Structures are given as structure tokens and as C-alpha cells.
Amino acid sequence: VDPRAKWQPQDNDIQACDYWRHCSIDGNICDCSGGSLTNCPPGTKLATASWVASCYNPTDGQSYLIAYRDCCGYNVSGRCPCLNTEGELPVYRPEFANDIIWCFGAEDDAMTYHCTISPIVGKA
């Protein structure tokens, strides 16, 4: 609703695009294809790489640093697709660039994008 409206996080449904941790997600939620909010689905490869974002926890009034690692080596899930860009910078500042495939580091050289996890890596 109003794709151009300020982001408004919630903290009650991790499979929705307005879930607080997904503030800078690009792709699909892993929780929708056999994974979890922070774990990869069976068969996929966890990347060591990530793009980061600092997202607001509406519940505690705090911000935490989110490391968006991708689960790779599979074709895109196609379930629960999102694209959030809270504080996303151009490609020339990759740390915070979300169009890049953050599969670097996955075993077996998996570089295909399947889904993205939203683990917290620290405050603020």
C-alpha cells in the first residue's frame, strides 16, 4: 500500500515485508522455503558475505545492525518476495548495497540466489 510511503516496521510476522529486520532485504524471506529467520533451508549454502543495514526495533525502540547473508546454490524460492531499501547506498558503497548477490563464501562455490536471512549482528 503506497509503495512510496515511509517504511513502518512491525514486529509480529517475520514472513511479511514490513517485519522490522527486513528493512534492507532484497529477494525472498528464507523462512518461506524451509529455512528460518536466521538459518538456511536444507540443501542451500550459507554465504559468508552480506550487505548490512541498521534497522529499527519498534518493540524496544532500538536499532540493530542486520547482516543480510544469502542462502545459495539454489534457484530463487519465489515465495515471500521483498525489496526494502532503508538506508541503501549506491553500488560504490557495497557494504550497504542490496542489488549485489551476497553469496560470496558459500560452500561449493554456490553463487545462485535462493533467499536471504535476517540475523542480528549487533546494536545500533
In order of their start, the domains of the chain are 1-124 (2.60.30.10)
116: left (phi over 0), alpha (psi -120 to 50) or beta: beta
Query: What does the block give as the cell for 47?
Result: 554465504
Q: Out of 20, 26, 70, 102, pick the active-site residue.
A: 70
Q: How far is CA 24 from CA 68, 90, 107, in A?
A: 8, 13, 24
Between the two ends of the chain, the Cα-to-Cα distance in Å is 28
What is the rounded CA–CA span in Å between residue 8 and residue 54? 14
What kind and span of H or E run contains 64?
strand 62-68
**Resolution of the model in angstroms:** 2.2
108 tagged catalytic: no
Handedness of CA 36, 13, 68, 27 (dihedral sign): positive
Report how far Cα 65 is from the mean position of its chain's Cα atoms: 12
Q: Is 7 a catalytic residue?
A: no
Tell me the technique behind this structure.
X-ray
Q: Of the candidates 96, 34, 99, which has an alpha carbon nearest to the alpha carbon of residue 71?
A: 34
Give the span between the Cα atoms of 39 and 36, in whole angstroms: 5
Q: Of the residues 51, 60, 102, 109, which is catalytic?
A: 51
